[PDB]
């Protein structure tokens, strides 16, 4: 097993996956690492099993159809994994905790949003459809763009959104286009 957390790339108190060489801090894994369960399999392994049980799940899909899906266990898992993939980028630190807004020439967004709030939302089963989760995620980056305006710091929002969108297209097998 790896000696660093797969998500934050730091050492510490790690839990090791029994079916692959990854390890995680307790609260870096999503969902949080389960108390007992031996063996334990991490979210990467659980996502791989879904694909292996239903190979046709990887054929291309329309984004509009994916968003209307109800949050049954498998879609819940996919959204957990997608969130995890955003936390895996170190630039996610900017979007993790609750932001505040006091900048000359800007006003704060009407509906603030941040990764830990989406984390809690998923944990408390507050989304009924994929759409709810995807709208909150995209809102994080859109609030950022709008607030920081022409400051170069806007680019951090573009960068983290690109990681989200790539991972969304992969995990949910969105049909490739030009
Ligand atoms: Zn970690
Ligand atoms: Zn694993
Ligand atoms: Zn089948």
Q: Which of 41, 19, 21 is nearest to 31 (CA)?
A: 41
Assigned token pair, 81: 């994994």
The secondary structure element, H or E, covering residue 123 is helix 115-123
Distances (CA, A) of 114 to 38, 83, 103: 33, 11, 19
Q: Which fold has domain 1-59?
A: Herpes Virus-1 (3.30.40)
Max CA pair span of the chain: 55
Q: Quick check: 26 and 15 in contact, CB under 8 A? A: yes
From-to residues of CATH 1.20.920.10 in the chain:
60-178
Please choose, from the candidates 133, 75, 93, 73, the residue with its C-alpha nearest in 3D space to the C-alpha of residue 7: 93
- Residue 74 Cα to ligand 3 midpoint, Å, equals 15
Asked whether the beta carbons of 133 and 175 are under 8 A apart, the reply is no
Q: What is the resolution of this structure in A?
A: 1.9
Closest ligand to Cα 55: 3
- CATH code 3.30.70.2740 for 60-178: no
SS3 16: strand
Ligand with smallest separation from the Cα of 19: 2
Instruction: Output the CA 18–ligand 2 centroid distance in Å.
Output: 6
Calculate the alpha carbon distances from 85 to 7, 30, 72, 150, 165 in Å.
Answer: 8, 10, 20, 28, 11
Question: Which ligand has an atom closest to residue 50 CA?
Answer: 3
Residue 87 gets the label, from left (phi > 0), alpha (psi -120 to 50) or beta, of alpha
Looking at the chain, the domain(s) classified CATH 3.30.40.10 span: 1-59
Torsion of CA 5, 51, 57, 53, to 10 degrees: -150
Among the bound ligands, name the one nearest to the CA of residue 2. Answer: 2
Ligand of minimum distance to the alpha carbon of 81: 2
∠ CA 107-98-157, nearest 5°, is 65
Tokens of 167: 């991972």
Three-state DSSP state, 154: helix
Measure 57 CA to ligand 1 centroid, in angstroms.
30
The residue written with tokens 């389960």 in the block is 34
- Ligand 2: centre distance to CA 143 (Å): 34
From first CA to last CA, the distance across the chain in angstroms is 39
């Amino acid at each position: 097993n790896s000696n660093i957390c797969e998500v934050c790339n730091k050492w510490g108190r790690l839990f090791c996956c029994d079916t692959c060489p990854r390890s995680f801090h307790e609260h870096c894994h999503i969902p949080s690492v389960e108390a007992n369960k031996n063996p334990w399999s991490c979210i990467f392994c659980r996502i791989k099993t879904i694909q292996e049980r239903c190979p046709e799940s990887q054929s291309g899909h329309q984004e509009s159809e994916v968003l209307m899906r109800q949050m049954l266990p498998e879609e819940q898992l996919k959204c957990e994994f997608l969130l995890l993939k955003v936390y895996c980028d170190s630039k996610s630190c900017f979007f993790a905790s609750e932001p505040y807004y006091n900048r000359e020439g800007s006003q704060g967004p009407q509906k603030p949003m941040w990764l830990n709030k989406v984390k809690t939302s998923l944990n408390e089963q507050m989304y009924t459809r994929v759409e709810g989760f995807v709208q909150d995620m995209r809102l994080i980056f859109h609030n950022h763009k709008e607030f920081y305006r022409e400051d170069k710091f806007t680019r951090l929002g573009i960068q983290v959104q690109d990681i989200f969108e790539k991972n969304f297209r992969n995990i949910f097998a969105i049909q490739e286009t030009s």
